Amino acid sequence: DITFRNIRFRYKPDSPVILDNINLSIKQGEVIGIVGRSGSGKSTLTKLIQRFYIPENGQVLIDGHDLALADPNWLRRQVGVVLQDNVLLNRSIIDNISLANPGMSVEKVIYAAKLAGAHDFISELREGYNTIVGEQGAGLSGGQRQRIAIARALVNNPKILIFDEATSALDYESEHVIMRNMHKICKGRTVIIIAARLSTVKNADRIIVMEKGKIVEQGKHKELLSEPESLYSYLYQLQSD
Amino acid sequence: DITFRNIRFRYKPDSPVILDNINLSIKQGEVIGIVGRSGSGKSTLTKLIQRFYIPENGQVLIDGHDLALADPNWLRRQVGVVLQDNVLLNRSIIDNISLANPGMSVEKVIYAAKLAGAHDFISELREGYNTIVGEQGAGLSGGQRQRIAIARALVNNPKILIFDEATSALDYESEHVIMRNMHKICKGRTVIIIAARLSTVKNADRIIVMEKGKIVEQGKHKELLSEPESLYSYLYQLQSD
């Protein structure tokens, strides 16, 4: 349902090759984890899904549609991206979550906040969902902001959801709620998670290991650990050393 | 050399109490980990060490100097903070690292970059340290940007170095490099590390567990892990399973 075929990418005609002959099929309903060293090409890979950039070689396809000849506006709607950092607008928490669709009532707002694990702390603020967030973003803490951003992205409701280190600063309990809810979140859609914390993607249907712009290893968490000399094993065994 | 006595803090006279009756002493040269749930008061604690805000009861002292009497110019040179997200200026890597002390010898810049684990990727670039970074912050990757920021802070050379989730989006190898270099990073200084990944603060001299604006637990990695009912043990058990 999402296909990378013979993808070769570099940023400038002078730039070194960033993505080197990548081939990948991601079928609808799959949770895909993407791991690898800092600078290996994880983010660049997700940018071709959005067509901020075009490859010099190969094709990107969604549902059999070549993105190179697809409608620009159509593609924008299909992809929702949650980054590491998120600025919230100087308005209420409910308004911030409902950005993509007001008129959508309090219940689907709360459900989105319950999925993101935000409803608890919002209920215990005095002003509640009517709490006006900062003129810069953070009248709240980093993780609270980030959970509001996740709740908003769920309301946005794209058919392709990209988490780019979205949870890596959240505490284990907070991330667990979101990863526990991943079964409801990815119903009828594709979820792509780029993680530095390997434990985040432990239950992905497929984990992709990037190195120097190549998909170097692949499989489930336990399948990747079967080879002790694998790159995935080396990073995993660095958890506490 | 860092003391909190009977600290009560809130952000506004309207705001609820964030930090309550906190007492903390951190001697010179130590490496301190701070852990806790999102919204527990970790960032707030470090904000008072810079006097962005002032308490209603209690005192903050650095090297025996009450911050109510401190020179604001002095304190900024004393406390250097690396956050989760960092902006680079649209100029060369060496100009970005050198910002605080330009004209400083090139091998001191390179040394700081080696401690951050940035030297290897910078050298592999076509233009090396002379590479003009993002027309935004980064024509680099997030983790590359982050390691440049860490190097920049080491060059600032503060007596107190605060990492607020600075490594949480770094891969296990890049973070391991920084933590192995920690024994050189904290030569003649104190280092405070806020992390969601509890493995990051494993070898810290002391670990501080925050919960709802209070220091609930305090000790060494395994001393805290030994407690059958402690929050630290509960949070660690959420990592492995």
Ligand SMILES: Nc1ncnc2c1ncn2[C@@H]1O[C@H](COP(=O)(O)OP(=O)(O)OP(=O)(O)O)[C@@H](O)[C@H]1O
């Ligand atoms: N705008 C850009 N122009 C030129 N090169 C870039 C640009 N953005 C990234 N790169 C380069 O492409 C390579 C991969 O970058 P990418 O952001 O995809 O890596 P990443 O795996 O997401 O890194 P991290 O894990 O640190 O976020 C790196 O060598 C990086 O320097």
Ligand SMILES: Nc1ncnc2c1ncn2[C@@H]1O[C@H](COP(=O)(O)OP(=O)(O)OP(=O)(O)O)[C@@H](O)[C@H]1O
């Ligand atoms: N600028 C601010 N104004 C008012 N309240 C704030 C501000 N920053 C944080 N708070 C509130 O103070 C409490 C503690 O915030 P703090 O940022 O210290 O938590 P934290 O432990 O750093 O969380 P995280 O791990 O998510 O960053 C939270 O309940 C938050 O809503």
Ligand SMILES: [Mg+2]
């Ligand atoms: Mg990236």
Ligand SMILES: [Mg+2]
């Ligand atoms: Mg914080």
